[PDB]
Amino acid sequence: SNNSIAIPTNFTISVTTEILPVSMTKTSVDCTMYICGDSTECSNLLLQY
Amino acid sequence: NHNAQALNTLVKQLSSKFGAISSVLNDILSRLDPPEAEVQIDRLITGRL
């Protein structure tokens, strides 16, 4: 309306939660061991790539 | 630094055989017939792509 306002007469103190990721798992991969394991032939072939 | 490293890798891969007889296309073309040259060039092309 031209001349109508709404003013609060009380308050509520509300606590809310916000969850945010910060870090992830740190992983290391040994390329030779994953691809080839204990095979020497596989390592020699991998050296070409 | 990062950019430099990236570019350096992209150049070092040019010296990788990727299972081909050689990492130089001119050597392959001047030393094998077109049928087998096709196989070697295909391996090199796949690796470099």
Swiss-Prot record, chain A:
UniProt gene name: S
Protein name: Spike protein S2
Residues modified by glycosylation: 2, 10
Disulphides: 36-42
Highest taxon listed in the record's lineage: Viruses
Function: Precursor of the fusion protein processed in the biosynthesis of the S protein and the formation of virus particle. Mediates fusion of the virion and cellular membranes by functioning as a class I viral fusion protein. Contains two viral fusion peptides that are unmasked after cleavage. The S2/S2' cleavage occurs during virus entry at the cell membrane by host TMPRSS2 or during endocytosis by host CSTL.
Annotated consequence of substituting residue 9 to I: In strain: Alpha/B.1.1.7
Range of the intact protein held here: 708 to 756 of 1273
Curated annotation (Swiss-Prot), chain B:
Effect of residue 30 to A: In strain: Alpha/B.1.1.7
Coiled-coil regions listed: 1-41
Top-level taxonomic group: Viruses
Protein's job: Subunit of the fusion protein that is processed upon entry into the host cell. Mediates fusion of the virion and cellular membranes by functioning as a class I viral fusion protein. Contains a viral fusion peptide that is unmasked after S2 cleavage. This cleavage can occur at the cell membrane by host TMPRSS2 or during endocytosis by host CSTL. In either case, this triggers an extensive and irreversible conformational change that leads to fusion of the viral envelope with the cellular cytoplasmic membrane, releasing viral genomic RNA into the host cell cytoplasm.
Protein name: Spike protein S2'
First-to-last residue of the parent protein present: 953 to 1001 of 1273
